[PDB]
């Protein structure tokens, strides 16, 4: 049921964001939602290449770090690489076959592409600070703590992709597959999508910002400054990405785009709340792993956990969910130095 | 046999440094050895008061330190306080009753006094960086690691003092005390003194310099800068003190002052070698205690142990002993910044 060029001449201004007629002609003279056109333009203006940044000095700083500080830095580096290894391919694979307006389609491709720059930038950093990069890259797959977060995050994508394939192949209804019952419901599929986006919003708006704090904390000590130059650029992008999903989510639940989605979004408003909280807690437990062997000047388990609650409360309200944590001010106000850009608001407000 | 004013009119230019006729008139128009007069003048010009130094910011830095870095800093602080608690009283109590030339007598009093300024300066630092100073001061006595070094160092003083009292009270020979044999030998007493001085030389020329490295390493990170201002002044003094004992030791073994001492110094040249090595090793094991919970930027067990071997080799040659360690250059050349003074060579050469 999916076609790379649907032959029907539809009015793309009146198509839903998702599950409508697949996009035929890619045109940018008009939009249903101009936010996605604005994101594309912003992302394109932000285009950067990793090797523009000298990370040489960072090798010296890294070697001079005490073991536990090495542990902190590299564990964080490995987590980021994992998250954007997923963000590199997944928006394309999971969302493209479902999008039905051109501006959203292009934004997703631009988004995913910008993630591949992020993944490349980690390779730039890793090769430059360790002797054998294979050890690091191999740990990313077999590290028990990292692996746990990978499995959870990738499942929201995988379940959406698999249910999508059934839908394209079988259409809605109840079917017989090798003598088993496979029930295809557009309503269920719409739900898998909504949760996936909520999940991805948490990934980019919370999980990554928790990681940025660890990076900039090094930069505050005037260490790993090349890495921090790069994280600044990544963070500036990340602010575009999370804005993207905040608008998809908010447009979906408002009923403005698709009325059935508004109902579905309320049906699982609890599930999304729970999803977010599970992410916030997983990041708190991650803080535990980072600082198991000790902390450093300016950052520790306690402080980072406060930032998690802080940042979580902000992202959740932005997508119309209830705050799960005590109202708290920013525990690390110095981070906003690093989360700055004259073209987009990187720092959470 | 000791008198605070011996009634004999002796020529103080021809008295031995030690064990001669107790000093009667304190005069400074003439010296046997002008080095001690030069030390006195230098020490007096160096006179400083602890409270001249603002250590306020150091409270903030201390609180911000990770636990293991707190452990490093305070363990080191506690060790210094112990060493100079001993250096405060011991040169006076152990050496005064034995000195027989005025310039040496005054130098020792000036020396011991300057140590009381050091002890006072630690109280200044401690009160300012912790909430309850009693915890710190109480740990200094009951800390198993510190306690070990205290016992060894204080025994060289105590055995000299006790043997001195017998000598003053009984004079040389073989005696009957409560039905026991107490043999008083000036030759033995001269030996207790020589070893004590060797021990004290190690204390000031090695043990304390190992400690200075820990302090300045913090200052290199731009932390605990008030403490480091103070350590700079203490170190400048310490260079005078170790110079004092290097000349007593070297004058004693050269036979220039007392011919019997030259023999005794060769009789136990092995014992002194061993003494020094035991001190160097104890400081290496101390490095282990400091960094048991992790190290910090610029200083760790390995690096500090190299400095111990380095500094030990230098001090030992200065007192005519064989080097126990491989010839090595300075592992922490940055320390010489802090060990500077235009009036005396603080940094080891």
XYZ file of C-alpha atoms in Angstrom, chain A residues 42-300:
259
model
C 17.169 26.657 10.356
C 18.814 23.242 10.239
C 20.319 23.974 6.815
C 21.778 27.290 8.032
C 23.315 25.446 10.992
C 25.190 22.950 8.796
C 28.588 22.138 10.260
C 31.359 19.584 9.789
C 33.003 17.845 12.822
C 36.585 18.231 11.526
C 36.185 22.035 11.619
C 36.973 21.573 15.319
C 40.448 20.938 16.696
C 40.135 18.247 19.356
C 43.887 17.628 19.677
C 44.330 19.181 23.108
C 41.510 16.964 24.347
C 43.752 13.883 24.077
C 46.140 15.442 26.582
C 43.311 16.423 28.961
C 41.791 12.945 28.709
C 45.052 11.149 29.531
C 45.594 13.468 32.496
C 42.135 12.693 33.922
C 41.909 10.446 36.967
C 40.449 7.053 36.119
C 36.980 7.840 37.519
C 36.818 11.118 35.577
C 37.789 9.154 32.440
C 34.932 6.823 33.330
C 32.517 9.728 33.535
C 33.571 11.319 30.260
C 33.735 8.186 28.130
C 30.561 6.601 29.538
C 28.727 9.763 28.582
C 30.404 9.826 25.161
C 29.377 6.217 24.587
C 25.750 6.923 25.580
C 25.511 9.869 23.155
C 26.938 7.814 20.343
C 24.357 5.121 20.974
C 21.451 7.578 21.133
C 22.341 9.221 17.838
C 23.289 5.951 16.182
C 19.598 5.325 16.649
C 18.569 8.881 15.798
C 20.626 8.600 12.607
C 18.533 5.891 10.946
C 15.280 5.686 12.908
C 13.359 8.878 12.053
C 13.783 7.940 8.380
C 12.948 4.254 8.677
C 10.000 4.673 11.050
C 8.425 7.987 10.024
C 8.970 8.356 6.262
C 6.550 5.567 5.215
C 3.798 7.265 7.224
C 4.214 10.962 6.346
C 1.729 12.542 3.933
C 2.778 16.202 3.708
C 5.981 17.249 1.935
C 7.307 19.738 4.497
C 7.211 17.101 7.238
C 8.803 14.547 4.936
C 11.720 16.842 4.147
C 12.094 17.911 7.766
C 12.475 14.298 8.858
C 15.129 13.626 6.214
C 16.953 16.797 7.146
C 16.660 15.835 10.807
C 17.989 12.309 10.342
C 20.784 13.607 8.147
C 21.845 16.130 10.769
C 22.042 13.200 13.180
C 24.565 11.455 10.918
C 26.783 14.521 11.306
C 26.447 14.024 15.053
C 27.459 10.375 14.854
C 30.426 11.318 12.660
C 31.465 13.943 15.186
C 31.719 11.281 17.916
C 34.024 9.236 15.748
C 36.140 12.381 15.326
C 36.314 12.786 19.113
C 36.883 9.106 19.955
C 39.689 8.477 17.427
C 41.446 11.535 18.794
C 41.408 10.782 22.512
C 41.900 7.010 22.832
C 44.538 4.698 21.415
C 42.222 1.908 20.242
C 38.750 3.239 19.315
C 37.490 -0.314 18.813
C 37.337 -0.808 22.583
C 35.012 2.179 22.989
C 32.821 1.361 19.970
C 32.544 -2.273 21.056
C 31.596 -1.277 24.626
C 28.643 0.731 23.256
C 26.993 -2.568 22.247
C 27.948 -4.802 25.178
C 27.834 -2.320 28.067
C 25.047 -3.564 30.355
C 23.893 -0.100 31.424
C 23.936 1.409 27.921
C 22.358 -1.725 26.454
C 19.319 -1.335 28.765
C 18.535 2.140 27.489
C 19.081 1.052 23.877
C 16.571 -1.777 24.136
C 13.814 0.427 25.567
C 14.339 3.327 23.169
C 14.618 1.136 20.068
C 11.437 -0.803 20.902
C 9.153 2.217 20.350
C 10.660 2.535 16.859
C 10.646 -1.216 16.119
C 7.028 -1.799 17.125
C 5.960 1.134 14.980
C 7.952 -0.137 11.996
C 6.648 -3.670 12.300
C 3.033 -2.582 12.698
C 3.535 -0.235 9.748
C 4.657 -3.097 7.510
C 1.561 -5.122 8.388
C -0.598 -2.106 7.639
C 0.954 -1.410 4.240
C 0.876 -5.107 3.396
C -2.488 -6.175 4.848
C -4.529 -3.012 5.329
C -6.927 -2.578 8.250
C -8.958 -5.530 9.560
C -8.453 -9.047 10.935
C -6.132 -11.407 9.026
C -4.742 -14.982 8.852
C -0.946 -15.304 8.906
C 0.476 -18.831 8.964
C -2.599 -19.865 10.920
C -2.323 -17.013 13.423
C -4.557 -13.981 13.966
C -3.047 -10.642 13.046
C -5.366 -7.719 13.761
C -4.444 -4.510 11.952
C -5.961 -1.390 13.507
C -5.178 2.095 12.209
C -6.255 3.267 15.645
C -3.616 1.038 17.294
C -0.999 2.066 14.719
C -1.781 5.722 15.384
C -1.132 4.941 19.051
C 2.253 3.267 18.402
C 3.251 6.427 16.528
C 2.153 8.841 19.263
C 4.072 6.932 21.933
C 7.134 6.651 19.690
C 7.190 10.442 19.195
C 6.734 10.988 22.950
C 9.632 8.611 23.470
C 11.785 10.413 20.897
C 10.864 13.745 22.470
C 12.162 12.454 25.801
C 15.312 11.178 24.101
C 16.200 14.502 22.564
C 14.675 16.997 25.014
C 15.712 15.217 28.215
C 18.182 12.328 27.805
C 20.528 14.330 25.589
C 20.352 17.443 27.724
C 21.350 15.373 30.739
C 24.350 14.305 28.671
C 25.173 17.885 27.594
C 25.487 18.816 31.283
C 28.196 16.201 31.833
C 30.106 17.508 28.783
C 29.888 21.179 29.664
C 30.832 20.464 33.257
C 34.190 19.335 31.877
C 34.341 22.488 29.776
C 33.636 24.536 32.944
C 36.824 23.045 34.370
C 38.534 24.117 31.137
C 38.946 20.492 30.098
C 37.861 18.722 26.913
C 37.194 22.059 25.304
C 37.226 20.693 21.760
C 34.554 18.197 22.676
C 32.513 21.049 24.177
C 32.784 23.176 21.023
C 31.251 20.213 19.222
C 28.562 19.586 21.852
C 27.521 23.271 21.527
C 26.795 22.682 17.832
C 25.060 19.371 18.529
C 22.959 21.029 21.248
C 21.956 23.822 18.894
C 20.664 21.152 16.493
C 19.037 19.211 19.290
C 16.925 22.248 20.137
C 15.539 22.117 16.588
C 14.823 18.397 16.775
C 12.945 18.518 20.095
C 10.986 21.516 18.787
C 10.024 19.381 15.811
C 8.566 16.598 17.933
C 6.928 19.059 20.352
C 4.942 20.465 17.445
C 4.031 17.059 15.998
C 2.843 15.945 19.412
C 0.979 19.195 20.148
C -0.660 19.317 16.711
C -1.720 15.686 17.025
C -3.350 16.015 20.474
C -5.004 19.360 19.668
C -7.189 17.563 17.122
C -6.321 20.289 14.615
C -4.650 17.845 12.243
C -6.567 14.614 12.812
C -9.581 14.314 15.179
C -9.045 10.593 15.889
C -5.523 11.356 17.101
C -6.848 13.783 19.697
C -8.911 10.982 21.229
C -6.048 8.498 21.087
C -3.716 11.037 22.711
C -6.105 11.368 25.640
C -6.608 7.584 25.848
C -2.888 7.147 26.521
C -2.122 10.465 28.250
C -1.310 8.325 31.286
C 0.934 6.017 29.275
C 2.930 9.006 27.997
C 3.226 10.462 31.467
C 4.570 7.100 32.637
C 6.883 6.888 29.643
C 8.457 10.246 30.486
C 8.838 9.377 34.158
C 10.502 6.065 33.252
C 12.982 8.070 31.162
C 13.669 10.581 33.934
C 14.332 7.766 36.376
C 16.550 5.875 33.944
C 18.662 9.025 33.585
C 18.851 9.301 37.391
C 20.097 5.718 37.608
C 22.568 6.545 34.858
C 23.900 9.384 37.069
C 24.614 6.657 39.591
C 26.682 4.713 37.027
C 28.689 7.802 35.977
C 29.660 8.703 39.525
C 30.090 5.196 40.969
C 33.860 5.716 41.379
C 33.635 9.331 42.486
C 32.591 12.684 41.091
C 34.330 15.834 39.914
C 34.346 19.558 40.687
C 30.947 20.947 39.785
C 29.048 17.742 38.997
C 27.834 14.753 40.991
